[PDB]
Symmetry: D2
Subunit: 508 residues, 4 copies
Amino acid sequence: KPNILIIMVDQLNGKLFPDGPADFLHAPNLKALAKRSARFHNNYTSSPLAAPARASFMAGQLPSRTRVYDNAAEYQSSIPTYAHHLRRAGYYTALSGKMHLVGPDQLHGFEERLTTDIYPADFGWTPDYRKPGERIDWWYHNLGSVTGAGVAEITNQMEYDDEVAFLANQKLYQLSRENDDESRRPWCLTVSFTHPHDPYVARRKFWDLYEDCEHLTPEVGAIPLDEQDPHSQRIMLSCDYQNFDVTEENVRRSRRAYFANISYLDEKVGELIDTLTRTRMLDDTLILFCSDHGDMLGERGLWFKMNFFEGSARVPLMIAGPGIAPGLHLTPTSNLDVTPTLADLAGISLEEVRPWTDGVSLVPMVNGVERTEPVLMEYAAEASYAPLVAIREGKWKYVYCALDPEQLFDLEADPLELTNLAENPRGPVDQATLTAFRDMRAAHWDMEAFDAAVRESQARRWVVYEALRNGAYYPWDHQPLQKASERYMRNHMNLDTLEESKRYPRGE
Amino acid sequence: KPNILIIMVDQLNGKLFPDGPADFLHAPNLKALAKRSARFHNNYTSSPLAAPARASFMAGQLPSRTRVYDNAAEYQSSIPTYAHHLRRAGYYTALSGKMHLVGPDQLHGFEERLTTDIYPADFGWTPDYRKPGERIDWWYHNLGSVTGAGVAEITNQMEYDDEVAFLANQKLYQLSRENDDESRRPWCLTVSFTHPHDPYVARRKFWDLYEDCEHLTPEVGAIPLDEQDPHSQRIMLSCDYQNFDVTEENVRRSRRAYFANISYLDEKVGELIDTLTRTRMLDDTLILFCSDHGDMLGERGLWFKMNFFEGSARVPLMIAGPGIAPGLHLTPTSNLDVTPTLADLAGISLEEVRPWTDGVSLVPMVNGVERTEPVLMEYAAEASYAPLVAIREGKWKYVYCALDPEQLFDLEADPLELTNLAENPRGPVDQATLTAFRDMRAAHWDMEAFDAAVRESQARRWVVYEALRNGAYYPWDHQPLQKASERYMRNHMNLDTLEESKRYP
Amino acid sequence: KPNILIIMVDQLNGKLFPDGPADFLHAPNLKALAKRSARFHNNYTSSPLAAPARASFMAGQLPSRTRVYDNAAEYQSSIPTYAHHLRRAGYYTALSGKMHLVGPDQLHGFEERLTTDIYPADFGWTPDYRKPGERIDWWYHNLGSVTGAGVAEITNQMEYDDEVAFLANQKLYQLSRENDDESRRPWCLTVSFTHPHDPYVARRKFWDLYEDCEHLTPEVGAIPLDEQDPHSQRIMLSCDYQNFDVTEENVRRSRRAYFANISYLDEKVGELIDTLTRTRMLDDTLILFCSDHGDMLGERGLWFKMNFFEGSARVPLMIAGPGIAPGLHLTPTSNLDVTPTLADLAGISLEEVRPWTDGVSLVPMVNGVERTEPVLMEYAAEASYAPLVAIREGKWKYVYCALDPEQLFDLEADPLELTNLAENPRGPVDQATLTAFRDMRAAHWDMEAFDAAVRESQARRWVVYEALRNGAYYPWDHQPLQKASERYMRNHMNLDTLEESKRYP
Amino acid sequence: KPNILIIMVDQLNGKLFPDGPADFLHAPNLKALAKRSARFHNNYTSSPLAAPARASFMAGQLPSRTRVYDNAAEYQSSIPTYAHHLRRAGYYTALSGKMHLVGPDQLHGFEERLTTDIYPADFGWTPDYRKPGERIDWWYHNLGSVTGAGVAEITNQMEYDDEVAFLANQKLYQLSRENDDESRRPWCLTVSFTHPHDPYVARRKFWDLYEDCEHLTPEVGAIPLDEQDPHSQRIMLSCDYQNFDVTEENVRRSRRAYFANISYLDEKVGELIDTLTRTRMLDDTLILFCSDHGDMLGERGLWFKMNFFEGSARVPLMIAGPGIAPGLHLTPTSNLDVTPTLADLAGISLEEVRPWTDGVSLVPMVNGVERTEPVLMEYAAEASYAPLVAIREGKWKYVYCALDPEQLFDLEADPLELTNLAENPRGPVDQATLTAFRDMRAAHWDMEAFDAAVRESQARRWVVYEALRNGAYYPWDHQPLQKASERYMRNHMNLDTLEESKRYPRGE
Ligand SMILES: C[N+](C)(C)CCO
Ligand SMILES: C[N+](C)(C)CCO
Ligand SMILES: [Mg+2]
Ligand SMILES: [Mg+2]
Ligand SMILES: [Mg+2]
Ligand SMILES: [Mg+2]
């Protein structure tokens, strides 16, 4: 069984990985990793928001099945994740960094978690479909990220990611000490960074890399509120866009700091791979690179995620290591496919994972078997007033919301999604394609039931959360375990025996 | 708003509370409490097993709605409980003792929990409908409790309940120090004991009280396996009955220690009442006495719970205090009614709890209003191979399982449930009644959907639990909060100011 | 090896134990214990203040040797205590309650400590010989305890002692589960209550016992400030006496509540004895009753301790159990003798404890052997401006401070210490006696070296403590160990095996 | 008040810093630091063993005064340290890394401690003068460090120091967030590394730096046991030297890994200085570089410390920052002088520190005032059977032990200490110098009282420690504080307010 290193980042627009990292990015370590990787060019999040995407990523199940509809929805402990599947199959599993799990279980199958979460574990960020049009200023996104972009040497997120990286490398060194033990468990380490999620604020060393950057304005500029589709209008209102004057210079500084933060992350990828190389674990390790959702980065005038346009819904996905053919894949894939792919790579049978996953293993794709299943997406959090669903199949993207006109995009002819073919069909094939996706949408979702489930989940939480914020608060944040009395040299040990056990490689 | 003291005990057969405690029980404090209480004589659990009964009790929802089907089913943190409803209404809420919550949330709305649980918080005790007939010896009930009954001065349970009682009285004293602050929150303290749950082992002082006891033998004796109904057979097999020779003296020793442990609990009830009296909180405090399920106590040859017969499904319920007229009520009620009753007594509107509770407030009954809503029960754990449901309405009890012959009992004519009127109707009224209950059951439950939901829950947990028991174990047991650097006299305080604040009256 | 139960109380005037508890005290359990005890009637503290007395008590060394001169002096972890000596000899050792250890070590050899301390563990209460005459209002004794005496159902101290008692009895029950394992360690449990230390506030049930009490007034009344000896004057000033109008009824209420809190403690003594009896450990258990210092209780107009007069310096001491002949002993003894007495009773050789203890075993006295070693006492805390030492030998008490007139009392002729024979000798024998005590004092103490050592200790702590109270505070208070994932039933265990191991007998 | 960064390392032979780091060392960051520093060439430990040196360093008091005679002697909480003095004067004080404090107080005035200790906090390593000639194999030094030298990518010590460095830099970044607050406290951060203490085992990257090294054998080779002075013989026996065949190749590999570990440390010095530079704190920060004791590194056949020869007793000392003239100082100085120097640099009056320190401030030396006080040293731990004391004054070193012949060395004429002038006086001046040091030794120490105090301390601890190791053990190791429920974003906070507070510099 190979080891598995999952490197996850937050809010990375997948269009920036057209074949590994785009040429204009300063990302030597991810570009070298890409050359060894199977690269999934048209890979999609299952839900364009952090906690829904991550609960879905961990379980290989859509939000409608995990019930994690938004950033404050409880993730049940009894739902199997890839950590459970691998752990059941004999793996040591650990997590360093972010997973935005909501509720008192902060492990969800991981055997060890090295850091707390950057974001809350409670029900505070619960949307309310009963009050459509409201926004909550103390936690909603707003365009102050765009007007406040710039340069700093420490931020909340850089403190977080510096520690995620350090503790992940330390864990790799600790794991190497078992390398000569025949009975060692294989390990699976998830390293989950919060960058390049906003605030768009970068260390000067990486900001300086992009002085001459030619990609600091999006190709598709800002669409006026009156000319926007209804969901994009709800997003603009939820970002408080009327109270911010976003200048061309703000757009450029935001994109520049965001690319700088990709370079910041690239340096950390290089450290992890260096640790794997020096500890002699690299040849036996699969490395997966992934992200939870994208960032519109100013395209169409939109920032952040919460929608199904390419910039928000596309995320990179790369896999390298023993048995993976390097190459670029164009067939659309999904984050839903990661858990069954990890299971397959770990030698777990198809039947063991079948009842628990909605995705498919990508290993047959890597080995030249055509993948035909569509890619599905869902959204049911802030800036929605009712659930949205999307189907990505072939060259098409279809988006449905009971409250909105449908959207249909031909991404081969119209990759910037500038022409809505459900509104303006080019001909008879477009009308037939629309009818096919409507039948497909009825085959996969009951949208009235979906809306009812989301409403009940929100209503429960608002009752419970109001109570939990009265009186003494009981926090659910993960606290990494304390072990000082068993670490380093203690006087129930023999010093020479301890030193030999902690040294690796030995006798060289 | 009144204070609320909830005294809960585990595995207390409600037939032993015919009008408060039975005369033969040595329970002077519970009898004095019962004399000033509204007493609900025909009160039922929602599910005859610890965790399902308690999750249902806390939420006022049936197991099919809470999804807590068995003793290892996760209770979701987002489900509102009476703790949430009261806390939201401005109560300080606390738990001392047992609640058998499964999963990483060990508070479920309680603001403070003073003890860990006596039982596990993880998925270990998950049944498996895919292996009907199996038993898990290391945690199933077995008849060894009956053959091992007797006397001891300490047990696992007595250690637990001694501490539960101590910390509850300590908390009451602590709360009394706020009794002169007009800004004080009203409090709701749940004190949840593990007795008289088995092992049937009692301290000598309480065992000696039942030497001449006339109730050491059940009136309905053991029914041989071949004459038992199918569910009773499944229970006997689950208890490993074939590997135990249960003598008459075994039966007598078990009941004697069980009664003795009721007397053990009665002394602790008196301690709490005493604390309320001397702190001068008694007149402003509602007191509820309740249990999660009963114990067959050898009746029909069965022990423990897991069934809908009276001894297992009946539990006492009493309410006393400000605005509570004392009296005996015979209309059937259930534990499902406690959470809406608590909300009503705390002044919460019916509309605030209507979407979250499926029982009804008993406060109208206390004030003379006739109740007509039937009582529903569910069971889907060990010794079931498919879910069972029951309906209790008027004089009738109806029990359905897709795998078993139906049962119908007329509890006025047949209080010991010796004649199954579904099999042996007395005439056309019994047949019409059976048809009426079948139609009512079909309107309330799809038993095939219920069975699918339970199997899905079991299978899910078996994947997860096998993973969680590999590698380093992460426990979910509640650990009461460590406060030593802030307790008593510390040198950021003024000693005189501290002594005055801690003195009451 | 016998078990050892040490019952310690705080601030108990030893004159109230003339032969066990005084007849007028309602203390049936302590009187029954005293009837089977060796009782040491003329027993003295080593230092009339909490932390110095207790550090001296634990080590069997005087404050000049432990360096614990006052209530804020660090007790070094390397100093052997009776806990170390017994633990080294194979005992499990535990503490429930108070010991007023100062510094980051809150165990000092105890293997387990069941409660935090009621008092601070840091250097806050450090006196300063550089500012003679100052008082620190936020922690000094003051006469407000006398004017504030009365009745309450909870206090800071009653919360503390209720918990001390509960956890001690719980621990005894836990220890009984090992009583049938031949490989068991013998145990030594120290149960250390804060009562009858002030505030003089009692529960109504115990206060009502002293309604017709004839001992509510001390026989020796208040001595006016100008007629007081210099040290007594320093105590009255330290207590802020000028700002309190202490009436006769104040005096009576304080003594009444103090006696009532002795009765409060007596009920807890009976609880412990009951636990030992029902667990069948009583016959194999030594029981020691002791106190750290006394309380003047208004005698001479003084309250509390900090002096060498009988009411402040006398503390009871009793020993009962296997191999202990009951009887009354009048030869002076001291708390310094407890640690070598415990070691001797546990079978530890005299040579193993000789280098670490400066008292003597009382076991020879119990067996009829005359004791001749004198009793020494020291004091160097608040209301002293330089150290004081005392010698107690035969009928005599001698008290020296470089700043004050000497005191010499003949306690046979003058048990209330009303005639200072150093100032008013009766004849040449008194003068020769004074000279003999002066020579003995000079051989035992260099008072100038003692004073330099105390000032150095105070000054050191004042530099350190001012730093430690800047920025984030790091508390040294003991936090009892969190064990919830290993207590009661957990799913790495077999339930039947667990129930059997936790049941005893 | 300037900030103060104290960089401490363990077991660094001071002869390797002849004027900053020796030319042959690969240490660019320490060499650049040295060019800005006042450098104390003839600086001495106060006691050649870890815990005695460190308790003495913290208090500015000799072991005879601190009572910390050996590696298991309790350090009383009531003894003032430089952390107390600075904290009382308004400083935030923190420690990352090792201080080998014995006893339940693991802070000794530090307001925060970021790591546990690498070594035990209990009484286990207590020598026993009642059994002269015994050794305790499970914790005594032995020459297996020399025969086991080599190359590894992780060791006990590298795991420790990697975390010391990471958490120290993180603390600097956190402290920078207060930089614009007028009411900020100044900070004093001690960063205390365990390298280059043995095992002599280094990462390959740094080992490779010394392939051509010309210093891999000591100038003074191994002295046979019969030809050794009595204390050196006791050290050889305590190291179990008879059971090890130390080859020339072992000597070279040990020295090579030790120099590699200096280079490992030099990289961490560079990171700390980079953090100070980017956070804009460097110009207001004093940087002190120091060590607890040396390492003989094979010289005379000896390894490790425990003696007063130059290699064991000399340690580097450098100070750089506002108001310090750079330059090299030859007058002998002591680690005892650090606490009163820090006090002086922080503006604390001489009188405030006078009753609590045995050393003198070095600031007047830096400013051209001649220092005349001698340097004193003491040793009373393993391989001593009675206390040893030493005086270093002018060109002389004098060593006294009641059980041994005296030693007298003229370090100007005889810098390798090859001629004992107390045994072979060159003339009448040598005999007069010996008599002067004897009178000086009687003026500073009562050696019989010293021996009695050490004996009583050992005897107490053996009683107590035997008891503490019966039954359940209560550990004293420092456990760094848990704060997950107050870290990063929690839902009692406003997200925008949090991000602004955690970003620094702001608005750039
Ligand atoms: C990331 N935000 C918290 C700003 C909004 C997502 O719920
Ligand atoms: C460093 N050693 C532990 C090996 C010896 C010093 O006491
Ligand atoms: Mg995200
Ligand atoms: Mg139960
Ligand atoms: Mg006291
Ligand atoms: Mg060292």
